[PDB]
Design an enzyme around this catalytic site. Structure first.
Site, mmCIF file in Angstrom:
data_model
loop_
_atom_site.group_PDB
_atom_site.id
_atom_site.type_symbol
_atom_site.label_atom_id
_atom_site.label_comp_id
_atom_site.label_asym_id
_atom_site.label_seq_id
_atom_site.Cartn_x
_atom_site.Cartn_y
_atom_site.Cartn_z
ATOM 1 N N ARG A 73 0.806 -1.190 0.000
ATOM 2 C CA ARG A 73 0.000 0.000 0.000
ATOM 3 C C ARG A 73 0.854 1.262 0.000
ATOM 4 N NH1 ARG A 73 0.381 3.062 4.694
ATOM 5 N NH2 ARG A 73 -0.981 1.609 5.985
ATOM 6 N N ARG A 128 -5.571 2.024 -4.272
ATOM 7 C CA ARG A 128 -4.796 1.347 -3.214
ATOM 8 C C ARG A 128 -4.748 -0.165 -3.569
ATOM 9 N NH1 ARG A 128 -5.259 4.329 1.767
ATOM 10 N NH2 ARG A 128 -4.861 6.501 1.119
ATOM 11 N N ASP A 135 -6.907 -1.725 1.244
ATOM 12 C CA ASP A 135 -7.449 -0.794 2.243
ATOM 13 C C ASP A 135 -8.274 -1.620 3.240
ATOM 14 O OD1 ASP A 135 -7.977 1.843 3.301
ATOM 15 O OD2 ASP A 135 -10.022 1.678 2.415
ATOM 16 N N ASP A 146 -10.420 -1.063 6.504
ATOM 17 C CA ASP A 146 -11.082 -0.020 7.335
ATOM 18 C C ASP A 146 -11.903 -0.672 8.432
ATOM 19 O OD1 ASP A 146 -9.896 1.886 5.633
ATOM 20 O OD2 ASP A 146 -11.844 2.420 4.658
HETATM 21 N N1 LIG Z 1 -12.194 3.223 11.418
HETATM 22 C C1 LIG Z 1 -11.026 3.472 10.904
HETATM 23 N N2 LIG Z 1 -10.462 2.414 10.200
HETATM 24 C C2 LIG Z 1 -9.306 2.576 9.658
HETATM 25 N N3 LIG Z 1 -8.452 3.705 9.651
HETATM 26 C C3 LIG Z 1 -9.061 4.724 10.364
HETATM 27 C C4 LIG Z 1 -10.286 4.624 10.965
HETATM 28 N N4 LIG Z 1 -10.617 5.843 11.611
HETATM 29 C C5 LIG Z 1 -9.589 6.661 11.392
HETATM 30 N N5 LIG Z 1 -8.612 5.962 10.610
HETATM 31 C C6 LIG Z 1 -7.403 6.641 10.182
HETATM 32 O O1 LIG Z 1 -7.480 6.866 8.735
HETATM 33 C C7 LIG Z 1 -6.116 7.124 8.412
HETATM 34 C C8 LIG Z 1 -5.950 7.237 6.924
HETATM 35 O O2 LIG Z 1 -6.281 5.887 6.381
HETATM 36 P P1 LIG Z 1 -6.587 5.726 4.823
HETATM 37 O O3 LIG Z 1 -6.701 4.215 4.600
HETATM 38 O O4 LIG Z 1 -5.516 6.418 4.039
HETATM 39 C C9 LIG Z 1 -8.166 6.475 4.551
HETATM 40 P P2 LIG Z 1 -9.095 5.704 3.225
HETATM 41 O O5 LIG Z 1 -9.542 4.327 3.702
HETATM 42 O O6 LIG Z 1 -8.322 5.827 1.953
HETATM 43 O O7 LIG Z 1 -10.440 6.565 3.112
HETATM 44 P P3 LIG Z 1 -11.839 6.287 3.873
HETATM 45 O O8 LIG Z 1 -11.593 6.238 5.334
HETATM 46 O O9 LIG Z 1 -12.704 7.451 3.451
HETATM 47 O O10 LIG Z 1 -12.381 4.978 3.322
HETATM 48 C C10 LIG Z 1 -5.302 6.128 9.149
HETATM 49 O O11 LIG Z 1 -3.979 6.451 9.323
HETATM 50 C C11 LIG Z 1 -6.067 5.915 10.402
HETATM 51 O O12 LIG Z 1 -5.385 6.458 11.558
HETATM 52 N N1 LIG Z 2 -15.979 1.600 -4.804
HETATM 53 C C1 LIG Z 2 -15.120 2.072 -3.882
HETATM 54 N N2 LIG Z 2 -14.712 3.296 -3.889
HETATM 55 C C2 LIG Z 2 -13.851 3.690 -2.930
HETATM 56 C C3 LIG Z 2 -13.373 2.844 -1.918
HETATM 57 C C4 LIG Z 2 -13.809 1.489 -1.887
HETATM 58 O O1 LIG Z 2 -13.505 0.616 -1.093
HETATM 59 N N3 LIG Z 2 -14.695 1.188 -2.923
HETATM 60 N N4 LIG Z 2 -12.648 3.327 -0.849
HETATM 61 C C5 LIG Z 2 -12.160 4.517 -0.911
HETATM 62 C C6 LIG Z 2 -11.299 5.055 0.193
HETATM 63 O O2 LIG Z 2 -10.825 4.076 1.050
HETATM 64 C C7 LIG Z 2 -12.389 5.458 -2.074
HETATM 65 N N5 LIG Z 2 -13.366 4.950 -2.950
HETATM 66 MG MG LIG Z 3 -11.278 3.315 2.967
HETATM 67 MG MG LIG Z 4 -8.378 3.051 4.931
#
Ligand SMILES: Nc1ncnc2c1ncn2[C@@H]1O[C@H](COP(=O)(O)CP(=O)(O)OP(=O)(O)O)[C@@H](O)[C@H]1O
Ligand SMILES: Nc1nc2c(c(=O)[nH]1)N=C(CO)CN2
Ligand SMILES: [Mg+2]
Ligand SMILES: [Mg+2]
Ligand SMILES: [Cl-]
Length: 158
Positions: free
Chosen positions: A82, A92, A95, A97
């Site tokens: 990543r 990515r 990811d 989450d």
């Molecule tokens: N529930 C959660 N799960 C995962 N990361 C989280 C989180 N809440 C806050 N974060 C924070 O989010 C930060 C950035 O993570 P990223 O993976 O770059 C965001 P993303 O998943 O691209 O977007 P998204 O959160 O809108 O899906 C991490 O360093 C982490 O500390």
């Molecule tokens: N369809 C889709 N779109 C996204 C996704 C994802 O998991 N699926 N996650 C994102 C940021 O983590 C940004 N956009």
């Molecule tokens: Mg995400």
């Molecule tokens: Mg994330």
């Protein structure tokens, strides 16, 4: 506690990335996989110059503290190459989450639980509903009911 983790991948062979992630998730200490969703092919939310995502969800039983679980999920992302681009919502390899950590509400600098945007995203809610149809959010709303109200398009299998 049951943690619900959303998985996404849109780079470097998403199917292989998601399979690798599932193995690695099962290798986290003090934790085990409970349930895995199907794999779905979803159009990107955000910038449109990126591939379709593979999206999935997993239920993970864990005794880790939330931030410790996060340390482990972040480590799996980096094991899978990543890279964080400057742009928000860009592509990515992997990811992971944390959608829900049991029924907890967490607000720290590193962690916001329930995931801040999941209620707006069919790509997060539909795989979650597949594995946890009876789920109730910390605020008392039922998953099943949220999906009704929002009427998000159903997803396509990968
Ligand atoms: N529930 C959660 N799960 C995962 N990361 C989280 C989180 N809440 C806050 N974060 C924070 O989010 C930060 C950035 O993570 P990223 O993976 O770059 C965001 P993303 O998943 O691209 O977007 P998204 O959160 O809108 O899906 C991490 O360093 C982490 O500390
Ligand atoms: N369809 C889709 N779109 C996204 C996704 C994802 O998991 N699926 N996650 C994102 C940021 O983590 C940004 N956009
Ligand atoms: Mg995400
Ligand atoms: Mg994330
Ligand atoms: Cl909630």
């Amino acid at each position: 506690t049951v943690a619900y983790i959303a998985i996404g991948s849109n780079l470097a062979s998403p199917l292989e990335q998601v399979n690798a992630a599932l193995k690695a998730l099962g290798d986290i200490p003090e934790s085990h996989i409970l349930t895995v969703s199907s794999f779905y092919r979803t159009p990107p939310l955000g910038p449109q110059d990126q591939p379709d995502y593979l999206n999935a969800a997993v239920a993970l039983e864990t005794s880790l503290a939330p931030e410790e679980l996060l340390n482990h999920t972040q480590r799996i992302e980096l094991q899978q190459g990543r890279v964080r681009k400057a742009e928000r919502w860009g592509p990515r390899t992997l990811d992971l989450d944390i959608m829900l950590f049991g029924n907890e509400v967490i607000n720290t600098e590193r962690l916001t639980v329930p995931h801040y945007d999941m209620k707006n995203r069919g790509f997060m809610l539909w795989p979650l509903f597949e594995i946890a149809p009876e789920l109730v959010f910390p605020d008392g709303e039922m998953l099943r009911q949220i999906l009704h109200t929002r009427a998000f398009d159903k997803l396509n299998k990968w």
